[PDB]
Structure 1
Amino acid sequence: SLSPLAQRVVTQLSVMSASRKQPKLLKLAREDLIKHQTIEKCWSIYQQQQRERRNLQLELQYKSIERSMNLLQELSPRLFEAANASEKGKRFPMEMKVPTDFPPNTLWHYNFR
């Protein structure tokens, strides 16, 4: 009927498939449904607020930068030129790592190079 390789392939396929592995549908009572809706809506609102806060902050930073660069242009042309360069190949430093869940054994390195 089937080889051992064929069997193993079938098993692998099954791992991915939804055939006889999935539970019943999540039914709720009307009160429960409402509670869920209120949870979700509030959360969504909170997320929107956070986005606006961050977005606003970014806008403020941009405005400050603009204000700075105009001033620099007014005062010292060479300094302005130096500031406003193409940073095409700018690379973030490899020490600035993505913050983990829990910290390492040695928290901070005081010596380098």
Structure 2
Amino acid sequence: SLSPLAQRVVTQLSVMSASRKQPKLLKLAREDLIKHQTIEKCWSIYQQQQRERRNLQLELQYKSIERSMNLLQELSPRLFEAANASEKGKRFPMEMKVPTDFPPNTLWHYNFR
């Protein structure tokens, strides 16, 4: 009927498939449904607020930068030129790592190079 390789392939396929592995549908009572809706809506609102806060902050930073650069242009042309360069190949430093869940054994390195 089937080889051992064929069997193993079938098993692998099954791992991915939804055939006889999935539970019943999540039914709710009307009160429960409402509670869920209120949870979700509130959360969504909170997320929107956070986005606006961050977005606003970014806008503020941009405005400050603009204000700075105009001033620099007014005062010292060479300094302005130096500031406003193409940073095409700018690379973030490899020490600035993505913050983990829990910290390492040695928290901070005081010596380098």
Task: Give the TM-score category using the shorter length.
Answer: over 0.9
Alpha-carbon offset, residue 37 of structure 1: 0.0
Alpha-carbon offset, residue 13 of structure 1: 0.0
Same amino acid, percent of matched pairs: 100
Alpha-carbon offset, residue 50 of structure 1: 0.0
Q: For residues 55 and 30 of structure 1, what CA distance do their matches in structure 2 show?
A: 37
Q: TM-score, normalised by structure 2?
A: 1.00
Q: TM-score, normalised by structure 1?
A: 1.00
State the secondary structure of the residue aligned to 1:35. Answer: helix
State the secondary structure of the residue aligned to 1:99. Answer: coil
Q: Who is 2:59 aligned against?
A: 59
Aligned Cα RMSD in Å? 0.0
Alpha-carbon offset, residue 81 of structure 1: 0.0
Unaligned runs of 5+ in 2: none
Superposed, which structure 2 residues align to 1:63-74 within 5 Å? 63-74=63-74
Q: For residues 91 and 31 of structure 1, what CA distance do their matches in structure 2 show?
A: 53
Alpha-carbon offset, residue 32 of structure 1: 0.0
Alpha-carbon offset, residue 94 of structure 1: 0.0
Alpha-carbon offset, residue 59 of structure 1: 0.0
Q: For residues 28 and 8 of structure 1, what CA distance do their matches in structure 2 show?
A: 39
Q: Who is 1:38 aligned against?
A: 38
- Following TM superposition, the consecutive aligned residue runs of length 4 or more in structure 1 with deviations greater than 3 angstroms are none
